[PDB]
Amino acid sequence: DEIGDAAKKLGDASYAFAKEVDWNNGIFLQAPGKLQPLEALKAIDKMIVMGAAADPKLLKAAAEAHHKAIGSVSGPNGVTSRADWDNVNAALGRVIASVPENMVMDVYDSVSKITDPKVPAYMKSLVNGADAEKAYEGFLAFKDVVKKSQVTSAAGPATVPSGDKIGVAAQQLSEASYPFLKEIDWLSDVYMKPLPGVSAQQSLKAIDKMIVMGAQADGNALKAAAEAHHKAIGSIDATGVTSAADYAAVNAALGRVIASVPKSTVMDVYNAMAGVTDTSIPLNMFSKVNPLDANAAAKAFYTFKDVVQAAQ
Amino acid sequence: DEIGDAAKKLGDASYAFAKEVDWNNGIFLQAPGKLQPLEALKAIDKMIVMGAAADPKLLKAAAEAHHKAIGSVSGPNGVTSRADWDNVNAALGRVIASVPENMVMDVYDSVSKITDPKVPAYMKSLVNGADAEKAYEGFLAFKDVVKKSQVTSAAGPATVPSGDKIGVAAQQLSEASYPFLKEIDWLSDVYMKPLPGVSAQQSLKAIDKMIVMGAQADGNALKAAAEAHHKAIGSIDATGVTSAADYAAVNAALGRVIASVPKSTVMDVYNAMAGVTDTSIPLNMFSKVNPLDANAAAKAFYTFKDVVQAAQ
Amino acid sequence: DEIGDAAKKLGDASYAFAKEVDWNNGIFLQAPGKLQPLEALKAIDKMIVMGAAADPKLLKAAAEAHHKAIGSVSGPNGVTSRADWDNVNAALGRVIASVPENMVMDVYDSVSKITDPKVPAYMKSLVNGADAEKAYEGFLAFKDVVKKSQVTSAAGPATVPSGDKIGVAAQQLSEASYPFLKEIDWLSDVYMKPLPGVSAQQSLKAIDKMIVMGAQADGNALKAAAEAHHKAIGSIDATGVTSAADYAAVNAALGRVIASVPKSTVMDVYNAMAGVTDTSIPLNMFSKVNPLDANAAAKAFYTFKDVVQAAQ
Numbered sequence: 001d002e003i004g005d006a007a008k009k010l011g012d013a014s015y016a017f018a019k020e021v022d023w024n025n026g027i028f029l030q031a032p033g034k035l036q037p038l039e040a041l042k043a044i045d046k047m048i049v050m051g052a053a054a055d056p057k058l059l060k061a062a063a064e065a066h067h068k069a070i071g072s073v074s075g076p077n078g079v080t081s082r083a084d085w086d087n088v089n090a091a092l093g094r095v096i097a098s099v100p101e102n103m104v105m106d107v108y109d110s111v112s113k114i115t116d117p118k119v120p121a122y123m124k125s126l127v128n129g130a131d132a133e134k135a136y137e138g139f140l141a142f143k144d145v146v147k148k149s150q151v152t153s154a155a156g157p158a159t160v161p162s163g164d165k166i167g168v169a170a171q172q173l174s175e176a177s178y179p180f181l182k183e184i185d186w187l188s189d190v191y192m193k194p195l196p197g198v199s200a201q202q203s204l205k206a207i208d209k210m211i212v213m214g215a216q217a218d219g220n221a222l223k224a225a226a227e228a229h230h231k232a233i234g235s236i237d238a239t240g241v242t243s244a245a246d247y248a249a250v251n252a253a254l255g256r257v258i259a260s261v262p263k264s265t266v267m268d269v270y271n272a273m274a275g276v277t278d279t280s281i282p283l284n285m286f287s288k289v290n291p292l293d294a295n296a297a298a299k300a301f302y303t304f305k306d307v308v309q310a311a312q
Numbered sequence: 313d314e315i316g317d318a319a320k321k322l323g324d325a326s327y328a329f330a331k332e333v334d335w336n337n338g339i340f341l342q343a344p345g346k347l348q349p350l351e352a353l354k355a356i357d358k359m360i361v362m363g364a365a366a367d368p369k370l371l372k373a374a375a376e377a378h379h380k381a382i383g384s385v386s387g388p389n390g391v392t393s394r395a396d397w398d399n400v401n402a403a404l405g406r407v408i409a410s411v412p413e414n415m416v417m418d419v420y421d422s423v424s425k426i427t428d429p430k431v432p433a434y435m436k437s438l439v440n441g442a443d444a445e446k447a448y449e450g451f452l453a454f455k456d457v458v459k460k461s462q463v464t465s466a467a468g469p470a471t472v473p474s475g476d477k478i479g480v481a482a483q484q485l486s487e488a489s490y491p492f493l494k495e496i497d498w499l500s501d502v503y504m505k506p507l508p509g510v511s512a513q514q515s516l517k518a519i520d521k522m523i524v525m526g527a528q529a530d531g532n533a534l535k536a537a538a539e540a541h542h543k544a545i546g547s548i549d550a551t552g553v554t555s556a557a558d559y560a561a562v563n564a565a566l567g568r569v570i571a572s573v574p575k576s577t578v579m580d581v582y583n584a585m586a587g588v589t590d591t592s593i594p595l596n597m598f599s600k601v602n603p604l605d606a607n608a609a610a611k612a613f614y615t616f617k618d619v620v621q622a623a624q
Numbered sequence: 625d626e627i628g629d630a631a632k633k634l635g636d637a638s639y640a641f642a643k644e645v646d647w648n649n650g651i652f653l654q655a656p657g658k659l660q661p662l663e664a665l666k667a668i669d670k671m672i673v674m675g676a677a678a679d680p681k682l683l684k685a686a687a688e689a690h691h692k693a694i695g696s697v698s699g700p701n702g703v704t705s706r707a708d709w710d711n712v713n714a715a716l717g718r719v720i721a722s723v724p725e726n727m728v729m730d731v732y733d734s735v736s737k738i739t740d741p742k743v744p745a746y747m748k749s750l751v752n753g754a755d756a757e758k759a760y761e762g763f764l765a766f767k768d769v770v771k772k773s774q775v776t777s778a779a780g781p782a783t784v785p786s787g788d789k790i791g792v793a794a795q796q797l798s799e800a801s802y803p804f805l806k807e808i809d810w811l812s813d814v815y816m817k818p819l820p821g822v823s824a825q826q827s828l829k830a831i832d833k834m835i836v837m838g839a840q841a842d843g844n845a846l847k848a849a850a851e852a853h854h855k856a857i858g859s860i861d862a863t864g865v866t867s868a869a870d871y872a873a874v875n876a877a878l879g880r881v882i883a884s885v886p887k888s889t890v891m892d893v894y895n896a897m898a899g900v901t902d903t904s905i906p907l908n909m910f911s912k913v914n915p916l917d918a919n920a921a922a923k924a925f926y927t928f929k930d931v932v933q934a935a936q
């Protein structure tokens with residue numbers, strides 16, 4: 001199609017740059033400058049709004065393209081194959097075209113507000129400058145083709161079930177675990193400390209299982225879950241804690257996402273995460289909160305997941 | 313006997329409740345409400361007084377019953393068999409009957425002072441309420457049978473060597489290690505942080521080795537060691553640290569306990585604990601004290617254990 | 625030779641003491657009293673000056689003697705064989721005789737300033753006192769033989785290369801990593817916290833690989849690298865951080881040391897260190913600094929090592 005043809009031209013312009021980027025650099029776990037959690041949350045919110053508006057089948061296809069790209073990584077910089085680079089870019093271009101321009105620009109603007117002005121020059125300094133310049137000229141041509149195809153209005157929101165078994169169970173989980181939620185330091189930098197002993201390629205294989213799960217999940221359930229997180233961001237207090245009602249709606253929506261893929265897909269995520277998560281990480285997190293509230297939350301989670309399991 | 317027959321009736325009333333308690337919940341590592349270390353120490357002291365007064369052969373038998381019960385645990389909640397539930401309850405009833413009523417009530421009163429009033433309702437909320445009520449009615453009938461057999465005066469105290477090789481060596485250990493003892497934060501919540509990567513059932517198998525060791529140990533030596541801890545609690549300062557003299561008496565008494573079982577029984581404890589203790593736990597503890605005082609204490613310990621080893 | 629013959633007499637006098645010392649005690653990782661980092665750095669500086677003045681072939685031979693001695697360790701206290709004790713003492717005596725008396729006395733004076741006056745008595749208390757006294761009388765006789773052979777003036781400095789590929793690359797590494805260097809707490813006691821789960825004998829086998837590497841490295845390159853550290857100490861600020869220029873000269877000098885042994889010698893060090901370094905140690909260090917500056921330093925290091933690798 002037009003975007004796919006344009007992605008091939010973009011690859012001609014940009015794959016030399018892609019091969020030189022060191023994708024295994026740990027810097028990409030960090031914020032693009034000083035960490036500003038609530039300012040960053042505004043940018044994530046714009047992304048969540050955009051993802052909720054995007055065509056669910058095109059989001060699926062873009063996830064699938066990234067899964068395939070992970071399988072073709074080679075060499076010391078972690079670069080995917082030329083064909084997969086193009087396949088990812090085409091799929092993302094189709095996603096971009098499925099939402100109105102203002103939603104895309106809102107992401108750009110909100111990310112630019114948290115990005116240190118010196119970040120582009122530092123990134124470019126690690127690669128061949130002419131190749132980066134050629135890649136960017138390629139991007140500018142590509143986005144013109146994307147815009148030609150781009151919708152001018154956003155699709156409406158998802159339907160939200162009420163009183164289903166997961167929703168009822170989520171109320172109980174949320175009441176039991178909100179004290180724990182309120183204890184957690186949502187503004188900490190700890191979430192960007194690296195996983196001890198885990199290479200980027202090993203992390204990527206765990207992320208892959210979540211990408212695969214996303215591609216399998218029900219698109220309407222995913223959309224509704226994104227919408228619930230947008231609501232929740234809007235209701236935070238000064239410490240970043242969402243309201244109790246919005247938390248419960250997040251838990252219900254995520255339970256419905258879990259139940260929209262088979263057990264094996266979810267266990268693949270869990271098992272891959274278990275392989276990369278040092279056992280001191282849960283201990284460190286637990287140690288920062290009230291231990292009674294954490295055990296109350298965990299007991300409630302293990303009860304809730306039985307309701308999800310039955311629905312799944 | 314009368315208590316054993318009553319324990320069978322108690323089991324008819326209470327085993328349904330036992331099967332539904334989630335014995336693998338980590339909450340039981342935590343204080344029953346907000347941690348109040350010096351108030352809890354008062355409760356532990358009442359337990360120590362009671363244990364020192366109890367019949368050593370009945371304490372032994374109760375330890376043995378728990379060892380046997382650990383072997384029959386099954387199912388997702390960690391419940392022991394019906395037969396072993398009864399065997400534990402009978403053995404504990406005999407222990408209770410071997411001390412005067414006031415010592416038992418002193419434990420109840422001192423634990424009640426640290427227990428949040430909402431704890432019973434939270435526990436009951438996790439199980440079938442009718443079964444918990446039936447279990448408690450069973451307990452009330454059982455305690456009447458126990459009371460009929462209960463002594464009215466406490467048995468006398470233990471015999472204690474003075475100037476034996478272990479006692480002399482304990483003086484040296486204690487002088488070398490009291491600076492370390494004083495450094496430790498006895499009022500911290502860290503001792504209730506869980507063992508990373510270790511399930512409740514794995515921890516239980518390590519605890520089993522200590523229960524086995526207690527069942528083998530000399531009852532008079534155990535009694536004397538309990539009495540030494542009661543005295544040591546009496547002399548604590550405002551930070552919880554006992555006097556140097558009472559510390560030395562504890563070390564001597566514990567050395568005599570160690571030497572009252574064979575080497576293999578003690579090494580079974582050590583090896584099981586090594587299997588559940590993350591190597592960062594000793595480091596974390598060491599990092600909170602003066603490193604010279606910790607090495608002085610450790611060197612003194614490894615000297616002391618040679619005297620214990622020879623006596624053993 | 626005269627020093628070797630005298631080392632045999634020293635061994636007759638001191639090996640009984642050596643067998644008694646508990647060389648596996650962790651206390652030797654710690655400062656000899658309260659840690660005083662900048663005062664200790666003055667003593668290290670005197671050792672660096674002395675090492676830079678010492679005969680490089682005799683330093684090599686003394687490193688080799690320690691490598692051999694590690695291989696003959698036996699028994700619970702970690703003592704090397706009698707023959708290797710003598711071989712080490714003779715080799716060290718020859719090193720001492722290769723520098724002027726004032727450089728040796730300067731080390732003694734600067735270490736004595738950081739050593740708590742009670743340290744000698746505590747060490748002696750752990751061994752047979754008569755054997756320690758016999759060993760010290762032996763040392764006093766030995767040092768008289770060493771002095772008879774001792775030079776009266778210091779050998780000259782090393783040649784400092786300029787503009788070689790390693791030096792040019794070190795400029796770039798140093799510019800990129802100086803922000804990280806400035807963040808590190810150089811005055812912390814953390815560097816003397818022990819390695820979790822690693823015995824002294826396991827640590828010793830990792831140190832052995834560095835001793836072997838030192839014995840193989842170019843003596844002039846080692847000398848120049850010592851001299852660069854002496855200069856860097858001279859330019860420290862109140863937090864202990866050397867100047868940017870002296871840091872760059874250290875990096876250049878160390879790169880030349882690395883490139884003066886084959887890759888396999890360096891990888892033997894790395895692999896042995898990987899076997900004794902808990903993966904939480906890099907995380908703990910990373911967590912104390914700016915994560916962007918640490919990743920900038922690391923990316924620059926992995927670029928720099930490619931230049932070293934080509935030269936090597």
Ligand SMILES: CC(=O)O[C@H]1CC(C)(C)C(=C=C/C(C)=C/C=C/C=C/C=C(C)/C=C2C=C(/C=C/[C@@]34O[C@]3(C)C[C@@H](O)CC4(C)C)C(=O)O/2)[C@](C)(O)C1
Pocket residue numbers: 044046047048050051052059104105107108140222223225226
């Ligand atoms: C249902 C559900 O769960 O959905 C989930 C789905 C996902 C996908 C997983 C997900 C996500 C992530 C999302 C949405 C990411 C969105 C990314 C958007 C990127 C936008 C970009 C780069 C935009 C721009 C705009 C630019 C403009 C450049 C110029 O105008 C400038 C300034 C000046 C002009 O003179 C010239 C110009 C050159 C024209 C530019 O250069 O770039 C999320 C949040 O998890 C939700």
Ligand SMILES: CC(=O)O[C@H]1CC(C)(C)C(=C=C/C(C)=C/C=C/C=C/C=C(C)/C=C2C=C(/C=C/[C@@]34O[C@]3(C)C[C@@H](O)CC4(C)C)C(=O)O/2)[C@](C)(O)C1
Pocket residue numbers: 018023024066069070071073077078079080085088089092093096100101104105142143144146147150200201204
């Ligand atoms: C650790 C490791 O190894 O990770 C490996 C992981 C993988 C996945 C295997 C891998 C890979 C591939 C990767 C990451 C590819 C990333 C591609 C990103 C593509 C982004 C695109 C196209 C984004 C946009 C945004 C657009 C915006 C367009 C507009 O806003 C613009 C401007 C101006 C408006 O006026 C009009 C507009 C139209 C609204 C657009 O048109 O396009 C790799 C490299 O191997 C690394």
Ligand SMILES: CC(=O)O[C@H]1CC(C)(C)C(=C=C/C(C)=C/C=C/C=C/C=C(C)/C=C2C=C(/C=C/[C@@]34O[C@]3(C)C[C@@H](O)CC4(C)C)C(=O)O/2)[C@](C)(O)C1
Pocket residue numbers: 059060063210211213214215222266267269270302
């Ligand atoms: C199209 C598109 O946009 O896709 C995007 C969609 C998203 C959603 C935005 C997105 C994402 C994120 C995704 C998918 C996240 C997935 C999360 C999965 C979580 C799974 C969990 C917690 C699983 C488990 C399993 C457990 C098991 C526990 C037990 O068995 C254990 C051990 C032992 C038993 O004795 C008891 C037991 C208790 C039974 C547990 O405790 O937990 C992504 C990547 O961006 C792609």
Ligand SMILES: CC(=O)O[C@H]1CC(C)(C)C(=C=C/C(C)=C/C=C/C=C/C=C(C)/C=C2C=C(/C=C/[C@@]34O[C@]3(C)C[C@@H](O)CC4(C)C)C(=O)O/2)[C@](C)(O)C1
Pocket residue numbers: 037038041181186187229232233234236239240241242247250251254255258262263266267270304305306308309312
């Ligand atoms: C910086 C900042 O301020 O950020 C703010 C951002 C927000 C969004 C506003 C905000 C918030 C709210 C947040 C994060 C809420 C998070 C909720 C997470 C819910 C996750 C759920 C339910 C996941 C699961 C996984 C499940 C797995 C189930 C199974 O695998 C299990 C086990 C075992 C299998 O055998 C069977 C199975 C069924 C397969 C399940 O059943 O459920 C907050 C707090 O305000 C912070």
Ligand SMILES: CC(=O)O[C@H]1CC(C)(C)C(=C=C/C(C)=C/C=C/C=C/C=C(C)/C=C2C=C(/C=C/[C@@]34O[C@]3(C)C[C@@H](O)CC4(C)C)C(=O)O/2)[C@](C)(O)C1
Pocket residue numbers: 030031032035036037038040041044184186187188189191192282283285286287289294295298338506
């Ligand atoms: C570009 C940029 O800046 O992006 C920014 C974007 C954001 C969104 C703003 C952002 C953010 C915030 C994020 C991701 C927050 C994530 C928070 C996660 C918190 C996780 C917690 C608490 C986990 C746990 C696990 C626990 C386990 C407890 C137990 O298992 C334990 C031990 C032992 C068992 O016996 C009992 C048990 C009870 C079961 C616990 O107790 O707690 C950030 C970082 O600012 C970056």
Ligand SMILES: CC(=O)O[C@H]1CC(C)(C)C(=C=C/C(C)=C/C=C/C=C/C=C(C)/C=C2C=C(/C=C/[C@@]34O[C@]3(C)C[C@@H](O)CC4(C)C)C(=O)O/2)[C@](C)(O)C1
Pocket residue numbers: 356358359360362363364371416417419420452534535537538
């Ligand atoms: C030598 C040596 O080392 O010994 C070691 C031995 C051990 C065993 C290992 C050891 C230990 C632990 C010990 C001793 C534990 C002791 C536990 C005691 C439990 C006591 C209980 C539950 C008592 C009560 C009392 C109750 C009263 C209820 C009522 O009166 C109430 C209010 C009102 C009435 O109207 C109705 C009523 C219903 C009548 C009740 O309901 O319960 C230790 C410390 O390590 C020392």
Ligand SMILES: CC(=O)O[C@H]1CC(C)(C)C(=C=C/C(C)=C/C=C/C=C/C=C(C)/C=C2C=C(/C=C/[C@@]34O[C@]3(C)C[C@@H](O)CC4(C)C)C(=O)O/2)[C@](C)(O)C1
Pocket residue numbers: 330335336378381382383385389390391392397400401404405408412413416417454455456458459462512513516
């Ligand atoms: C992680 C995991 O799996 O752990 C597993 C570990 C095990 C061991 C295998 C296991 C098990 C079994 C367990 C824990 C059993 C516990 C039993 C407790 C019994 C307690 C008893 C009888 C206590 C008392 C107290 C009494 C007090 C009586 C009086 O004070 C009363 C009232 C009133 C006074 O006026 C008169 C009095 C007479 C003075 C009494 O008469 O009796 C299980 C379940 O499998 C879990």
Ligand SMILES: CC(=O)O[C@H]1CC(C)(C)C(=C=C/C(C)=C/C=C/C=C/C=C(C)/C=C2C=C(/C=C/[C@@]34O[C@]3(C)C[C@@H](O)CC4(C)C)C(=O)O/2)[C@](C)(O)C1
Pocket residue numbers: 371372375522523525526527534578579581582614
């Ligand atoms: C009837 C009744 O009431 O029973 C109750 C009685 C109690 C007492 C109240 C009770 C309890 C608690 C109990 C039993 C506690 C037991 C504690 C045991 C501690 C044992 C220790 C530290 C053992 C070791 C072994 C070590 C070995 C070290 C070395 O070998 C190593 C690696 C390598 C060699 O090269 C050098 C070495 C240096 C030689 C060491 O360093 O330490 C309980 C459970 O309540 C039951």
Ligand SMILES: CC(=O)O[C@H]1CC(C)(C)C(=C=C/C(C)=C/C=C/C=C/C=C(C)/C=C2C=C(/C=C/[C@@]34O[C@]3(C)C[C@@H](O)CC4(C)C)C(=O)O/2)[C@](C)(O)C1
Pocket residue numbers: 349350353493498499541544545548551552553554559562563566567570574575578579582616617618620621624
């Ligand atoms: C909250 C609060 O305030 O609490 C307060 C409570 C108190 C009680 C008042 C208090 C206090 C004092 C305390 C805790 C003192 C603790 C003393 C512990 C002593 C433990 C000893 C000796 C244990 C052992 C184990 C041994 C093992 C020996 C062997 O295995 C070894 C190695 C190797 C084998 O080959 C041979 C072997 C021979 C088998 C041994 O020889 O000895 C304090 C500080 O005031 C705090």
Ligand SMILES: CC(=O)O[C@H]1CC(C)(C)C(=C=C/C(C)=C/C=C/C=C/C=C(C)/C=C2C=C(/C=C/[C@@]34O[C@]3(C)C[C@@H](O)CC4(C)C)C(=O)O/2)[C@](C)(O)C1
Pocket residue numbers: 668670671672674675676683728729731732764846847850
């Ligand atoms: C190029 C390269 O790689 O260099 C590296 C090489 C190394 C070797 C690895 C290295 C190193 C370490 C170095 C140099 C260590 C130096 C050690 C020196 C020790 C000196 C000693 C014990 C000196 C003395 C002096 C004493 C004097 C005693 C008396 O006078 C006193 C007071 C009073 C008189 O009345 C009696 C007396 C009895 C006469 C004594 O008793 O002891 C370094 C730094 O890494 C650099």
Ligand SMILES: CC(=O)O[C@H]1CC(C)(C)C(=C=C/C(C)=C/C=C/C=C/C=C(C)/C=C2C=C(/C=C/[C@@]34O[C@]3(C)C[C@@H](O)CC4(C)C)C(=O)O/2)[C@](C)(O)C1
Pocket residue numbers: 642647648690693694695697701702703704709712713716717720724725728729766767768770771774824825828
């Ligand atoms: C964990 C573990 O197991 O580690 C194992 C590691 C090994 C390596 C295997 C091992 C071993 C052996 C070891 C450590 C041996 C150490 C030997 C040290 C020797 C030091 C010597 C000779 C130092 C000096 C200093 C001198 C100074 C002389 C003068 O200044 C003096 C006074 C006075 C001036 O007026 C004149 C002077 C002339 C200037 C001198 O003449 O001599 C062991 C024991 O097995 C432990």
Ligand SMILES: CC(=O)O[C@H]1CC(C)(C)C(=C=C/C(C)=C/C=C/C=C/C=C(C)/C=C2C=C(/C=C/[C@@]34O[C@]3(C)C[C@@H](O)CC4(C)C)C(=O)O/2)[C@](C)(O)C1
Pocket residue numbers: 683684687834835837838839846890891893894926
């Ligand atoms: C004669 C005399 O005086 O001798 C004395 C001389 C001295 C010098 C004073 C002395 C000393 C100290 C010495 C020798 C120190 C030696 C330091 C060596 C440092 C080596 C380092 C960091 C090596 C590496 C290797 C790495 C590998 C990384 C990778 O491969 C990895 C994993 C995976 C790939 O995919 C990518 C990769 C990135 C390629 C790395 O990242 O780092 C001593 C002991 O006193 C003796």
Ligand SMILES: CC(=O)O[C@H]1CC(C)(C)C(=C=C/C(C)=C/C=C/C=C/C=C(C)/C=C2C=C(/C=C/[C@@]34O[C@]3(C)C[C@@H](O)CC4(C)C)C(=O)O/2)[C@](C)(O)C1
Pocket residue numbers: 661662665805810811853856857860863864865866871874875878879882886887890891894928929930932933936
């Ligand atoms: C207390 C106090 O204040 O102390 C003050 C003390 C000072 C000295 C004044 C001071 C300072 C400065 C300091 C410490 C500087 C430290 C510099 C360290 C440089 C280390 C280097 C370059 C090491 C290496 C190792 C390399 C390995 C390369 C390879 O193995 C690699 C990877 C992979 C293989 O396949 C190939 C290979 C080629 C084999 C390499 O290429 O390089 C400061 C900060 O002021 C503090």
